[PDB]
Each structure stands twice: as structure tokens, then as C-alpha cells.
Amino acid sequence: KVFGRCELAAAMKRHGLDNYRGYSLGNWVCAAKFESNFNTQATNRNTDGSTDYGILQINSRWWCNDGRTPGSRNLCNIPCSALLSSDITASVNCAKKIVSDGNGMNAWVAWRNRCKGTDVQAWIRGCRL
């Protein structure tokens, strides 16, 4: 499922992401935009053999099990395929664990390079939240 900007904002808000660990809703929507272009089915292979899954491009080396990343930890206790679902619950729950890890949203490269320090409030403009 490819989410609309405001549709995703509302879904993330309902799932408790607005201001989670101090990150306003705009940050999460911006991250999703640049990580997967709002597509829940996005997957990307990394040079180290691990794969990024879903709306927030969560990595298989540490967070989910995809059966093909040797020596990986499954910290979110879920199969990576669960992260490609149209229901973002699994992605959100796992994202919460990642952002609490210590590096905050810096864990998401696209966020660090394209959202951090920008007017993230623009990502939720016009939305009925």
C-alpha cells in the first residue's frame, strides 16, 4: 500500500509516534517519505547482505529475521515480511524500539541527511489530525 502524506500522518499519530522520544510527527512522515516514498512494500539490499524493509526501511541485521542474514539479531522479534504489511503497526512498534536505542532518529540515514534540521512541520501542513 502506498500511503498519502496526510493519511500516513494520521495513522502514525494514532499509533503514538507524535512526539515519541521528542520527535514531532513531521520527522516521522519526512523519514517515511525519503526512506520508502510512503510504500509499505519497499525493500532494499545493502552491500553487507542485509535488507531494509517497509515504510521505515528497518534493517534485517539487527531488527527482524528474514532467514538470509547470517549472525543477525532479531531485536523486534518479528519476520521482516511483517514490516511490508498495509497495517503499519509492526513497523511502528519496531521503530519505537530503534529510536529508543540511543542514537535517536539518526539510525535512519535518509532522516539524518534530508530531514534533520529542516522545517519538518511542513510534512503535516494541511492535514486534519
Swiss-Prot record:
Annotated gene: LYZ
Annotated ranges, domain C-type lysozyme: 1-129
Active site (UniProt): 35, 52
Amino-acid positions noted as binding substrate in the UniProt annotation, renumbered to this chain: 101
Cellular localisation: Secreted
Catalytic activity from the UniProt record: Hydrolysis of (1->4)-beta-linkages between N-acetylmuramic acid and N-acetyl-D-glucosamine residues in a peptidoglycan and between N-acetyl-D-glucosamine residues in chitodextrins
Cysteine disulfide partners in this protein: 6-127, 30-115, 64-80, 76-94
Gene Ontology terms: biological process: cell wall macromolecule catabolic process; defense response to bacterium; defense response to Gram-negative bacterium; defense response to Gram-positive bacterium; killing of cells of another organism
GO-annotated cellular components: cytoplasm; endoplasmic reticulum; extracellular space
Record organism: Gallus gallus (Chicken)
Protein name per UniProt: Lysozyme C
UniProt lineage: Eukaryota, Metazoa, Chordata, Craniata, Vertebrata
